[PDB]
Every structure is written in structure tokens, then in C-alpha cells.
């Protein structure tokens, strides 16, 4: 295959190979897999021209194989060349799994806020808040509030409830959810207090 | 665009600056109108005739300079061009002998498994005529039977150019494979029996095997380490795991309610 | 079930296992084997 | 008059009633199992689809005049099915169309009204609730237009209708139907489309465009889950990879998707046949023969299904290289006409030492061998005959002078005999040993004993099997 | 909307799991 | 905003539906065995 060009270290050729290749990854999805070391090396070193482009094709190949953890990692590394996109099966799958990783990380850290919280790659927020904005390009989608409560973020919660139609029926809905089907007292009372303030 | 079409090929091609000319050619072809595309155009057809010819010369220079990675790279590119979604491709005179040389390379580097799987594409040119393809399959057949001396007898007949750069390696690999087949547990074998085998010089290469391999270098009374193997299955204690198995059977006789 | 594979292009003595022509029947072979010695 | 008027009474009655009540009961059951018991995989839906595949398809090829089956479209063309009167009136319309067709001439389609009988069918407040009915009644018109056996003015329509149905099902599954999993039917649809593409690729260019489309098709599967979807797409794609473009082999060797454990039994046979073909063509012979025999007995139980013939014409060559076939056992009534003419003459030549007769048979039937796409025999079988002789020598003698095999196997020299026997032992066909001193070949040690640690290794496997079967059985007992 | 269905699905799933464990235990003692 | 998050909250619950759908039947089977 055209990997026959990647074999050469001339910098001019490399980017032509990657640009030509990511156009056909789907038809030859598995065939490529005996080359992922080369692409990873060409991502790790500094001073290439489109390190994001190598990270992108790596993410595509690992999404073929369903190694979702590593597709996620390289998608974080792939920067804006990926993250700016917004309408495909591939992106929606890996952003869903990113949301999942983020919410579970948040829930874990929330039990020990006093320190030594594990690091958060800010790209996770860089994707989550982008989705939050999509859930802001709209009048009052309930789901936004759902993810808000699920991720323990009172800030975007408040910003969403005050923004858009702050119909008091909606905050009565929020009180109903707070009382009806959530139980962790230490989070319950915090949500309830921010609600009494806004009220 | 015609960068010394026949500058240093018609009369003599020893140039190392030909490498620089090829570098310029590869730098220029990447900016040509169509490489990846398969819809094609007559202009694209010209660009493709040009790419095919330059790749052919690149591969032949590779064999002339006896470089391996450049050989496999150029051959992969050309084989991608030769068969493809677009293959109008008026016949090129070098296709047959170059493909035969490719098969010789595949056989010499002991990739026999990938040999036959490349032979499916050729329906009739591999048997009736076209001696270039005939040669490597015939040698493969010769080396599938225990017949060996016939290979060395028939070595001196090659329809294309010398191509010895691969035939020497093939002979060496056949020699070492035949040696490996004569795997000997007994450390003592008569070296004269090996002398009968096609080892040629009595101590020139006998020392080479002697340095690492066992036996002696032409002794006629070999002394060295032995390749005898004993199972040593005397131990009667697979008890730790066999007990596991039994407990497991008891596990699935219960815990269903 | 149809597989689109286009399949369509004497004695009840049962299995004959493997018989190979010997030509000479046992009577001939032994009849003239004895003659030698 | 004596042939058209007199033969008209007999025909009309049967399609008027039996087919209509068939599709009525099938649609009723589909609605019932889609409404209740959301896990409707185990139902008569699959049996109904199989019966339609088997029975209804063959009963007719022509456009079914007198409005017997062509009238169903004008029956269900206007369907509301919103409330009780709407569904009742759609059924009444079906009945009234049948009655009119039995009384007078109902609506007829002149090879161009099927689109209005398909556009208006999805028009007139059509019901999404019977999405499966839409698919079934849209695919059934394909087979008539497909199995018209004309290949004129219907293949193009077949391709357009197939694209329509594919788009409809893709848009339907874009909503990701909940607790329904229409894929249980979709698979068949997919196969059907591939059918016409082959027909298309029989009337026109190959199915490469289909290849891209179906890569996308299995990609949209395997993500949520798998329900008989990928299990079909895999063998469809590697069918096209090996469909007169079989020269491509390198890739599929890296098709590393796991094949789903619980599949329809009929498909496992296709999978194992193709796996056997790919294994044998690249020169592995140990696994090929065993997995191919496992394939043959997997689902052969039918009155001359047809591809069993091909698997036999492969297993004979693939095991000719290693031993002996049942020489007269398998030449029985179905295969006898084909297998006998070339393959029997071959194996007969192979056991004997007649090279000239081998060449004669090769010259005679090479065209048939290439037509079958199994021309490996000349490639390797001609030059591997001596292996059988070595095997026989192994079975009989136990201590022999290698100077004798030369006169027994016409090699004319002892040294190359040493070479060929050494190669054979290295290859593992025989585990003998050689005294490299005085032309002595000896067999391995006698079989030590058949009751030391080799037996119980098998009984462990059989327990795993038996306890697994009992658990599987007890679990799925009496659902309500 | 979908949030309530999501949560209720989770709850009823785990609760029928609890019933399942209960039934296994009662089987075990009734046999004795 | 043109079905911003309909592909979420929707593919997430389908597995839940299938799991509970089968698990209830399993529970009823155990019910019958215990009763007898």
C-alpha cells in the first residue's frame, strides 16, 4: 500500500502520505494495523508539521479495532483538527465515551476533594463544554440539566437554569428531581442550597 | 517533464548522481496532477506512463546497487500501479521479467508462504510461454522435492539478465536449510558425510559452522555438544492443577438453584 | 435454502474398497511361482 | 379459449386465498410480537420469513395476471391504520381487492405502475407501526422483479427499488428503534440487495460499490450490538473478495473480527467453507481438512442442496496431498455424475505410479478444473506424489535399509532418498529415525501405553461439554 | 424527559437483581 | 438545536431495556421452581 511512501524520512513526503491515507482508512481499516508503531513514532517526536494529523489517523485505526481507551487518548492529543468537528458516527461515539470517562472521573474525585485529586486533561472540558454549548444553542433542553446534575457541576447548572426561560415551573421540576430520586446527602444539600439562593 | 529521459542508461549507467536525478524526479512527481486517482484522463494517462517508467528504472537501479529496502519499496509502489482500480495500461515490455525477478526475491528470502498467494493472478502466462515467470516456479518445484543437485546443475541458465544478486543468496539459503534438516542429536557424526554434502571447501566454511554449530570442522569424528532431547516426564505430580480440575467439577455440580 | 451456487451442471454390490488390476489371477501367479522352485 | 378460459378457473382460487391468508397471519404475528414481548427474536417471524424465502418465491415468475399477487399492492396502497376503523378498513380493502380480482379485473401493473404502487403504498397515511410489513411487502416485489428470470427491464428497476428500501431502512434505524431490533429482518433485506448486485454485477460491473456500501453497513453494526447482522455481512464481503476477484487474498487474512458464537446454523457452513478455502490456498493443510469436514456435517441435511458437491470437490484434493480418501465410499447418487469423471480418475492415478496417465487426465479435464477454481493440483499435487509412498513405507515396515526404498520407490539412488526421507521426518509425516552409518531406517519406539495421562485429557473436554449442555438446557425453560 | 426513564430503568434493574439473590438463597435452604 | 443530544440518552437506555427484559423472565422461572 501507500505506506510504501511513509518508509522515507523526507519531510515533504510524509504529510502527502498521511493526507492521502486518511481518505481511504475505512476501506482498508484493518490492513493498516501493522503500521501503528510508525505513526505513533511520527506523532511523539517534536518538530513535525502536522502531529495532529498523525494523531487523527491513529484515532481512526484504533476506533476500527474498538480499543476505545486509546482512540480517546489520541483524540485528546489530536487537538482542534478533530475536536472542531461535529457530525459523524465516529466523533459522536468517541465523544460519548469521553463524556462517560469525564463523569466517572468527576464522581470519583468528588469523594476526596481535599487534595490529591487525579489530574484532568483540560481537553476533556474542551469537549464537554462544547457539547454543553450545543445544549445551549437551544431554548431549554432538559437533557442539559441532566448531564449538569450527573457531573456534579453546579456552575453550568446555575448558568443554564438562569439563562433561557427561567420559568419557575422549571425550578420546581429541579426540586422534584432533587427530592425524588437522588440520595447522597452531601450532594443533595449542596444542590438544594444553590437552588434556594437562585430562588 | 522529461528530466533526462535517457541521460545515462543507453550506453552505461554507473552514475551515483542518478540517485540525485531520481530524488528530483520523486520530488516532482508528487506535484503531478494524478497519482492516487483512478478515474483517469489521457493527460493522467501520460502522467501514469511516466510514473511507471521512472519506477521501473528506480527498481532496476536498486538491483544494480544491491539495495534491499529501496528494492522492496519501489517494487511495492510499482505493484500497486500494475494492478489497481484503474488498469487500462497498455502493455509494458518489462512487466513479465520484472515480476519474475520479484518472485525470485520472494523465494530467496524464504517467504514461500507468500509465494503461491501472489501466483493466483497469472492465468496462462506462467505455463505455456513467457520464460521469465517459468523459471522461478520451476525452481520452486525443484526445491519442493528432495531433489537438490538438479538445482545447482540448472543454475547456469537464466533467461533475463544475470540476476545473480539473488541466486547467490538462494544457494546459500538452500545450503543452510539442508544443513538444518540434518539435525543431529548425536554429537559424533562422520565429517566425511558432510563432505559428501554440498559444503565445498573443506575448512573454509567448516570453521564457520564450527564456531557456533556443533560437531567438528571436517574431523571425521565429530566432538561437541549434543542435540539429544529427553522428555523427563517422570514427575507424577500434576497434583496442584488436577486437584483444581476436580474441585471445578464439584463447583458445577452445585451452585445452581 | 438456496445458495446461488448453480449446482446442476450400475451395480448394487456396495463399496468396492480398493481393487487394483493384477491381471494374473491368483491361480496363474501361484501356478507358475511353484515352477521356479 | 380452451387453454386460457378453461385454465383460468383453477389458478385464480389458490392465490386468491392461500397467499393472502399466509401474509395476513404473518403480519398479525409480527404486530403481536412487536407490540408485546419486546424480545420477539424467538417467534414465528423468522419462520414466516423463511417460508416466504422458500415457498412463495418459487410459486410464480410471471406478473401473476388476474390480479392474484400483483393485486396486493393495489390492496394495501391506501392504508391508514391509525385507530380501529382505519386498520379494519385497510383489511377490508385487502379483502375487497381479492374479491374484485376473483369477480372482475382489478388493478394491473404494466412494468411501470409498480412505482405508483410503491410510492402511493408509502403514501395515503401509511403506517410506520408496521415497518416490518413495509419492508416485507417492499422486498417481496423485488423477488418477482428479480426472479422474473428475464434480466430485461427489471434489473435496473431492481437496483432502484433496492436502493429505495436500503435508504428507508437506514433512515428507520437512524432513529434506533427501541425494544424492536428490526435488524432481525434487515439482514435478509441486505442479502436480497446483494443478490441483485450480483445480478447487476452479472449484467454489469462487479460489486465494488456494493463492497464500500457494505463496509459501511457492518460498521453501523458491531457498535450497539450484533443481532445476526455482522454474521451475514462478513461472509457477504469475503464472498465478493473471492468472487472472480478471488486473486485478492492478502487482505481478508487480517479480517480479525470475532465471528459471533450464537449464529444461525446454516451460515456457519458458509463461514467454515470460506475459512477452509483461504487456509488451503496459502499452504496450511493440517487445519484445513479438519475444519472443512467439520463444515460438511454442520448443515448438510437436505435433498441435494448443492454446494456439498463443491466442498467434496475441495476436500478430495486438499486431503489427496496427505494420504488417501475413501476411494469408493463417497461416490453415491447425487455427486456421482460430476466427481466421478475427473476426481476419481485422479485419485486412481495417484495411488498407482503411472505418471503418464496423470498427465493424460490433466490434459483431458484441465478446463473443468479451472472452471471450478481449484487448479492447485498441478501446482503441488503432481510434485508431491512421493509423500504417499513414504507414508506407506512407514505403515508397513519398521526396520529397513534405505538402499531398498530406491528400488521400491524408483528413485534410482540412495542419497537423494536420504534427503527426501529426512525432509519428510522434519515435516512430521513420519517420526522415524535414521542411523547415518549403514543405511538403517528404524521406526520410533513402540507405542508406550495408551493409559498414561493421554486418556484423561480427553475426558476433561467431554465433561466441559456435558455440563455446559445441561446448564444451557435448564436455563431456558418455561418462559411464562 | 429521558432523564427520568434512564433513572427508573437503573432502579428497577438493580431491585430485580436483589430479588434474584433472595430466591437463590431460599432454594438452598428448602432443599436441606 | 436540531436534536442536539438525541443520539445520547437514547442509545444509552436500549441496553437497559434489553437487560431487564430478559432478567424478568429469568426471575419468573425461579419463582415457579421455588413454589413447587
DSSP D325-343: --TTTS--TTTHHHHIIII
The DSSP secondary-structure symbol of D385 reads T
Q: Does D325 lie in the same domain as D379? A: yes
Chain A: list its partners (3+ Cβ pairs within 8 Å). B, D, E, F
Q: What share of chain F is helix, strand, coil (3-state, %, to 5)?
A: 60, 0, 40
CA separation (Å) from D300 to B53, C8, D86? 54, 17, 47
Chain D, residues 225-254, CB within 8 A of chain F, namely 225
Number of continuous H segments (helices) and E segments (strands) in chain A: 12, 0
CA distance D55 to D51: 5
Q: Do chains B and A have 3 or more beta-carbon pairs under 8 angstroms? A: yes
CA distance A72 to A94: 6
CA distance A68 to D130: 37
CA separation (Å) from B45 to A4, A96, B95? 22, 46, 17
At A137, list the grid cell. Answer: 444553542
Question: Cell 547467490, residue?
Answer: B168
Cross-chain Cβ contact A142/E3 below 8 Å: yes
Phi, then psi, of A36 in degrees rounded to 5:
-65, -25
At D297, list the grid cell. Answer: 456435517
Q: Which residues of B touch D421 (CB under 8 A)?
A: 146
The DSSP secondary-structure symbol of D5 reads T
Closest by CA to A158, choosing from A126, A197, A116, A125, is A197
Checking A127-132 for CB contacts under 8 A at 24+ apart, the result is: A127/A83, A127/A95, A127/A98, A127/A99, A128/A98, A128/A99, A128/A102, A129/A156, A130/A83, A131/A95, A131/A99, A131/F5, A132/A156
Radius of gyration of chain A (CA): 21
Beta-carbon contacts of residue D83 (< 8 Å; ≥ 6 apart): none
Q: Does D397 lie in the same domain as D279? A: yes
Q: Does D448 lie in the same domain as D398? A: no
Which secondary structure element, helix H or strand E, spans residue D434, and what is its range? strand D433-435
- Is E21 strand, coil or helix? helix
CA distance D155 to D63: 15
- Is D399 strand, coil or helix? strand
Chain centroid offset of residue A32 CA:
25
Indicate left, alpha or beta for D262 from its phi (over 0: left) and psi (-120 to 50: alpha): beta
The CB density around residue A90, as the number of other CB atoms within 10 Å, is 17
- Is D440 strand, coil or helix? strand
Q: Does D387 lie in the same domain as D331? A: yes
Q: Which residues of E touch B257 (CB under 8 A)?
A: 23-24, 27-28, 31
Least CB–CB distance from B76: residue in A4, A8, A23: A4
Chain centroid offset of residue D358 CA:
33
The number of folded domains in chain B is: 1
CA distance D72 to D93: 10
Least CB–CB distance from F1: residue in A92, A137, A146: A137
Residue E24, chain B, CB below 8 Å: the answer is yes
Work out the widest C-alpha separation in chain F, in whole angstroms: 57
Question: How would you label B168-179 residue by residue, b for 16+ Cβ within 10 Å and e otherwise?
Answer: eebbeebbeebe
Chain centroid offset of residue B74 CA:
15
Work out the widest C-alpha separation in chain E, in whole angstroms: 49
CA separation (Å) from D27 to D23, D131, D146? 6, 11, 23
Q: Do chains C and F have 3 or more beta-carbon pairs under 8 angstroms? A: no
**Strand order across the D399-400 sheet:** D399-400, D440-442, D433-435
CB F31 within 8 A of CB E23: yes
CB A113 within 8 A of CB A90: no
Residue B256, chain E, CB below 8 Å: the answer is no
CA distance A72 to A62: 9
Residue A92, chain D, CB below 8 Å: the answer is no
CB D220 within 8 A of CB D166: no
Q: Does D365 lie in the same domain as D461? A: no
Which secondary structure element, helix H or strand E, spans residue D441, and what is its range? strand D440-442
Closest by CA to E7, choosing from F16, A35, D210, is F16
Beta-carbon contacts of residue D257 (< 8 Å; ≥ 6 apart): D222, D230, D234
Q: How far is B161 from chain D (nearest CA, A)?
A: 26
CB B178 within 8 A of CB B209: no
Number of continuous H segments (helices) and E segments (strands) in chain D: 23, 3
Chain D, residues 12-71, CB within 8 A of chain F, namely 38-39
Chain centroid offset of residue B244 CA:
48
CB D247 within 8 A of CB D281: no
Of chain C, the end-to-end C-alpha distance in Å amounts to 68
CA distance D118 to D120: 6
Q: Which residues of A touch D212 (CB under 8 A)?
A: 26-27
CA distance D239 to D82: 43
- Return the residue of E nearest to F28 by Cα: E20
CA distance A160 to A156: 6
CB A95 within 8 A of CB A131: yes
Cross-chain Cβ contact F11/A96 below 8 Å: yes
- Is D433 strand, coil or helix? strand
Q: How far is F28 from chain E (nearest CA, A)?
A: 10
DSSP code string of B62-86:
HHHHT-SHHHHHHHHHHHHHHSSS-
> Positive or negative, the Cα torsion across A111, A117, A118, A121?
positive
CA distance D394 to D433: 11
At A88, list the grid cell. Answer: 459523524
Q: Does D398 lie in the same domain as D470? A: no
At A32, list the grid cell. Answer: 493498516
Q: Which domain range does residue B110 map to?
A: 1-252
Q: How far is F1 from chain E (nearest CA, A)?
A: 16
Resolution in A: 3.8
* Residue B112 located in a structural domain: yes
Closest by CA to A95, choosing from A105, A107, A85, is A85
Q: Which residues of B touch A4 (CB under 8 A)?
A: 73, 76-77, 80
The CB density around residue D147, as the number of other CB atoms within 10 Å, is 15
Give me the half-sphere count of Cα atoms (radius 13 Å) on the Cβ side of residue D460: 13
The DSSP secondary-structure symbol of D400 reads E
CB A22 within 8 A of CB A60: yes
Cross-chain Cβ contact E6/F19 below 8 Å: no
CA distance A164 to A175: 18
Angle at A7 between CA A40 and CA A58, to 5 degrees: 25
Cross-chain Cβ contact B30/A2 below 8 Å: no
Q: Which residues of D touch C4 (CB under 8 A)?
A: 195, 198
Q: How far is C1 from chain D (nearest CA, A)?
A: 7
> Positive or negative, the Cα torsion across D302, D303, D304, D305?
negative
Closest by CA to A33, choosing from A43, A25, A23, is A25
Closest by CA to F9, choosing from D156, E7, D442, is E7
- Return the residue of E nearest to F26 by Cα: E20
Cross-chain Cβ contact D254/A26 below 8 Å: no
CA distance B38 to D328: 53
Cross-chain Cβ contact E11/A142 below 8 Å: no
Q: Does D393 lie in the same domain as D454? A: no
Question: How would you label D210-231 residue by residue, b for 16+ Cβ within 10 Å and e otherwise?
Answer: bbebbbebbbebeeeebbbbbb
Phi, then psi, of D400 in degrees rounded to 5:
-140, 150
At E8, list the grid cell. Answer: 427508573
Of chain B, the end-to-end C-alpha distance in Å amounts to 82
Give me the half-sphere count of Cα atoms (radius 13 Å) on the Cβ side of residue D446: 2
Give me the half-sphere count of Cα atoms (radius 13 Å) on the Cβ side of residue B233: 5
Give me the half-sphere count of Cα atoms (radius 13 Å) on the Cβ side of residue F2: 4
CA distance A142 to A170: 9
Give me the half-sphere count of Cα atoms (radius 13 Å) on the Cβ side of residue D384: 20
CB F31 within 8 A of CB E28: no
Q: Does D372 lie in the same domain as D279? A: yes
Q: Do chains E and C have 3 or more beta-carbon pairs under 8 angstroms? A: no
Phi, then psi, of D174 in degrees rounded to 5:
-60, -30
The DSSP secondary-structure symbol of A31 reads G
Question: How would you label A145-159 residue by residue, b for 16+ Cβ within 10 Å and e otherwise?
Answer: bbbbbebbbbebbee
Cross-chain Cβ contact D419/B148 below 8 Å: yes
The CB density around residue A180, as the number of other CB atoms within 10 Å, is 9
CB D233 within 8 A of CB D217: yes
Cross-chain Cβ contact F5/A134 below 8 Å: yes
CB B135 within 8 A of CB B158: yes
Q: Does D278 lie in the same domain as D397? A: yes
Q: Does D469 lie in the same domain as D361? A: no
Cross-chain Cβ contact C3/D306 below 8 Å: yes
CB D270 within 8 A of CB D292: no
At A10, list the grid cell. Answer: 523526507
Question: Cell 380480482, residue?
Answer: D101
Residue A90, chain D, CB below 8 Å: the answer is no
Closest by CA to D283, choosing from D390, D427, D421, D393, is D427
- Return the residue of E nearest to A141 by Cα: E1
CB B67 within 8 A of CB A1: no
Q: Angle formed by the axes of helices B131-144 and B95-108, to 10°?
A: 20
* Residue B123 located in a structural domain: yes
CB D339 within 8 A of CB D309: yes
* Residue B257 located in a structural domain: no
Cross-chain Cβ contact B73/A7 below 8 Å: yes
Residue A26, chain D, CB below 8 Å: the answer is yes
Cross-chain Cβ contact F19/E13 below 8 Å: yes
CB D387 within 8 A of CB D424: yes
Which secondary structure element, helix H or strand E, spans residue D260, and what is its range? none
CA distance B254 to B249: 9
* Residue B82 located in a structural domain: yes
The DSSP secondary-structure symbol of D478 reads -
Q: Which domain range does residue D451 map to?
A: 443-477
> Positive or negative, the Cα torsion across D331, D333, D335, D336?
positive
> Positive or negative, the Cα torsion across D396, B229, B175, B115?
positive
CA distance F4 to E28: 51
CA distance D61 to D149: 7
CA separation (Å) from B153 to B113, B132, B139? 26, 19, 11
Q: Does D456 lie in the same domain as D378? A: no
Phi, then psi, of D433 in degrees rounded to 5:
-140, 155
Amino acid at each position: 500500500g501507500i505506506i510504501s511512501l511513509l518508509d522515507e524520512d523526507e519531510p515533504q513526503l510524509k504529510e502527502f502520505a498521511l493526507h492521502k491515507l486518511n481518505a481511504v482508512v475505512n476501506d482498508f481499516w484493518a490492513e493498516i494495523s501493522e503500521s501503528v508503531d510508525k505513526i505513533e513514532v511520527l506523532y511523539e517526536d517534536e518538530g513535525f508539521r502536522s502531529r495532529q494529523f498523525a494523531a487523527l489517523v491513529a484515532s481512526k485505526v484504533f476506533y476500527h479495532l474498538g480499543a476505545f481507551e486509546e482512540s480517546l487518548n489520541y483524540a485528546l492529543g489530536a487537538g482542534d483538527l478533530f475536536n472542531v468537528n461535529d457530525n459523524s458516527e465516529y466523533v459522536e461515539t468517541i465523544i460519548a465515551k469521553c463524556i462517560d470517562h469525564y463523569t466517572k472521573q468527576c464522581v470519583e474525585n468528588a469523594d476526596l476533594p481535599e487534595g490529591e485529586k487525579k489530574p484532568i486533561d483540560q481537553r476533556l472540558e474542551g469537549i464537554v463544554n462544547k457539547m454543553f454549548q450545543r445544549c445551549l444553542d437551544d431554548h431549554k433542553y432538559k437533557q442539559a440539566i441532566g448531564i449538569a446534575l450527573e457531573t456534579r457541576r453546579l456552575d453550568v447548572f446555575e448558568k443554564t437554569i438562569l439563562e433561557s426561560n427561567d420559568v419557575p415551573g422549571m425550578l420546581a421540576y429541579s426540586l422534584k428531581l432533587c427530592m425524588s430520586l437522588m440520595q447522597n446527602k452531601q450532594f443533595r444539600n449542596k444542590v438544594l442550597r444553590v437552588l434556594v439562593k437562585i430562588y | 517533464m522529461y528530466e533526462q529521459l535517457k541521460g545515462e542508461w543507453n550506453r552505461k549507467s554507473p552514475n551515483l548522481s542518478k540517485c540525485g536525478e531520481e530524488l528530483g524526479r520523486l520530488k516532482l512527481v508528487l506535484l503531478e496532477l494524478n497519482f492516487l486517482p483512478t478515474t483517469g484522463t489521457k493527460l493522467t494517462k501520460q502522467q501514469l506512463i511516466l510514473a511507471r517508467d521512472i519506477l521501473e528504472i528506480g527498481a532496476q537501479w536498486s538491483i544494480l546497487r544491491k539495495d534491499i529496502p529501496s528494492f522492496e519499496r519501489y517494487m511495492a509502489q510499482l505493484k500497486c500501479y500494475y494492478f489497481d482500480y484503474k488498469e487500462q495500461l497498455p502493455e509494458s515490455a518489462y512487466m513479465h521479467q520484472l515480476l519474475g525477478l520479484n518472485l525470485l526475491f520472494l523465494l530467496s528470502q524464504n517467504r514461500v508462504a507468500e509465494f503461491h498467494t501472489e501466483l493466483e493472478r497469472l492465468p496462462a502466462k506462467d505455463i505455456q510461454t513467457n520464460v521469465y515467470i517459468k523459471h522461478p516456479v520451476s525452481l520452486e518445484q525443484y526445491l519442493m522435492e528432495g531433489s537438490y543437485n538438479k538445482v545447482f546443475l540448472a543454475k547456469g541458465n537464466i533467461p533475463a539478465e544475470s540476476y545473480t544478486f539473488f541466486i547467490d543468496i538462494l544457494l546459500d539459503t538452500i545450503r543452510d536449510e539442508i544443513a538444518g534438516c540434518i539435525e543431529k542429536a548425536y554429537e559424533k557424526i562422520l565429517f566425511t558425510e558432510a563432505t559428501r554434502i554440498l559444503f565445498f571447501n573443506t575448512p573454509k566454511k567448516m570453521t564457520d559452522y564450527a564456531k557456533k554449530r556443533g560437531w567438528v570442522l571436517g574431523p571425521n569424528n565429530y566432538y561437541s555438544f549434543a542435540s539429544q532431547q529427553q522428555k523427563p516426564e517422570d514427575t507424577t505430580i500434576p497434583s496442584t492443577e488436577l486437584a483444581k480440575q476436580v474441585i471445578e467439577y464439584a463447583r458445577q455440580l452445585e451452585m445452581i438453584v | 435454502m438456496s445458495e446461488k451456487k448453480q449446482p446442476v451442471d450400475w451395480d448394487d454390490d456396495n463399496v468396492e474398497d480398493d481393487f487394483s488390476n493384477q491381471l494374473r489371477a491368483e491361480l496363474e501367479k501361484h501356478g507358475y511361482k511353484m515352477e521356479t522352485s | 379459449p380452451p387453454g386460457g378460459g378453461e385454465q383460468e378457473p383453477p389458478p385464480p382460487p389458490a392465490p386468491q386465498d392461500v397467499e393472502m391468508k399466509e401474509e395476513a397471519a404473518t403480519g398479525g404475528g409480527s404486530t403481536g410480537e412487536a407490540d408485546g414481548k419486546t424480545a420477539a427474536a424467538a417467534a414465528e417471524h423468522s419462520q414466516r420469513e423463511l417460508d416466504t424465502v422458500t415457498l412463495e418465491d418459487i410459486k410464480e415468475h410471471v406478473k401473476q395476471l388476474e390480479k392474484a399477487v400483483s393485486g396486493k399492492e393495489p390492496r394495501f396502497v391506501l392504508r391508514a391504520l391509525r385507530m380501529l376503523p382505519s386498520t379494519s378498513r385497510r383489511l377490508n380493502h385487502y379483502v375487497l381487492y381479492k374479491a374484485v380480482q376473483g369477480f372482475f379485473t382489478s388493478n394491473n401493473a404494466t412494468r411501470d405502475f409498480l412505482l405508483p404502487f410503491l410510492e402511493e403504498p408509502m403514501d395515503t397515511e401509511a403506517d410506520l407501526q408496521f415497518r416490518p410489513r413495509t419492508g416485507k411487502a417492499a422486498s417481496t416485489p423485488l423477488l418477482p422483479e428479480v426472479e422474473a428470470y428475464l434480466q430485461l427491464l427489471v434489473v435496473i428497476f431492481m437496483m432502484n427499488s433496492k436502493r429505495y428500501k436500503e435508504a428507508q431502512k437506514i433512515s428507520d434505524d437512524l432513529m434506533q428503534k427501541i425494544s424492536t431490533q428490526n435488524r432481525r429482518a434487515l439482514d435478509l433485506v441486505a442479502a436480497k440487495c446483494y443478490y441483485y448486485h450480483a445480478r447487476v454485477y452479472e449484467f454489469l460491473d462487479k460489486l465494488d460499490v456494493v463492497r464500500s456500501f457494505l463496509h459501511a453497513r457492518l460498521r453501523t453494526a458491531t457498535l450497539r450490538h450484533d443481532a445476526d447482522g455482522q454474521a451475514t455481512l462478513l461472509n457477504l464481503l469475503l464472498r465478493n473478495y473471492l468472487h472472480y476477484s478471488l486473486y485478492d487474498q492478502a487482505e481478508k487474512l487480517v479480517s480479525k473480527s470475532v465471528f459471533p458464537e450464537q449464529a444461525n446454523n446454516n451460515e456457519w457452513a458458509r463461514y467454515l467453507y470460506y475459512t477452509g478455502r483461504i487456509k488451503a490456498i496459502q499452504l496450511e493443510y493440517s487445519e484445513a481438512r479438519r475444519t472443512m469436514t467439520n463444515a460438511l456435517r454442520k448443515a448438510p441435511q437436505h435433498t441435494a442442496v448443492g454446494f456439498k458437491q463443491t466442498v467434496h470437490k475441495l476436500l478430495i484434493v486438499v486431503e489427496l496431498l496427505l494420504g488417501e480418501i475413501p476411494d469408493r465410499l463417497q461416490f453415491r447418487q447425487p455427486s456421482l455424475k460430476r466427481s466421478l469423471m475427473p476426481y476419481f480418475l485422479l485419485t486412481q492415478a495417484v495411488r498407482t505410479g503411472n505418471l503418464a496417465k496423470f498427465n493424460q487426465v490433466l490434459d483431458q479435464f484441465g478446463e473443468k478444473f479451472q472452471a471450478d477454481g481449484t487448479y492447485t493440483l498441478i501446482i503441488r499435487l503432481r510434485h508431491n506424489v512421493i509423500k504417499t509412498g513414504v507414508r506407506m513405507i512407514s505403515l508397513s515396515y519398521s526396520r529397513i535399509s534405505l538402499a531398498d526404498i530406491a528400488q521400491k520407490l524408483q528413485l534410482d539412488s540412495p542419497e537423494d532418498a536420504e534427503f527426501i526421507v529426512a525432509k519428510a521426518i522434519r515435516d512430521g509425516v513420519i517420526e522415524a529415525s535414521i542411523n547415518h552409518e549403514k543405511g538403517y531406517v528404524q521406526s520410533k519406539e513402540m507405542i508406550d501405553i495408551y493409559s498414561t495421562r493421554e486418556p484423561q485429557l480427553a475426558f476433561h473436554q467431554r465433561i466441559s461439554f456435558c455440563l455446559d449442555i445441561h446448564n444451557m438446557s435448564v436455563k431456558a425453560m418455561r418462559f411464562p | 424527559d429521558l432523564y427520568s426513564r434512564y433513572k427508573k430503568l437503573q432502579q428497577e434493574l438493580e431491585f430485580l437483581e436483589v430479588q434474584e439473590e433472595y430466591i437463590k438463597d431460599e432454594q438452598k435452604n428448602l432443599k436441606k | 438545536a436540531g436534536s442536539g443530544l438525541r443520539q445520547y440518552y437514547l442509545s444509552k437506555i436500549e441496553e437497559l431495556q434489553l437487560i431487564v427484559n430478559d432478567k424478568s423472565q429469568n426471575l419468573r422461572r425461579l419463582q415457579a421452581q421455588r413454589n413447587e
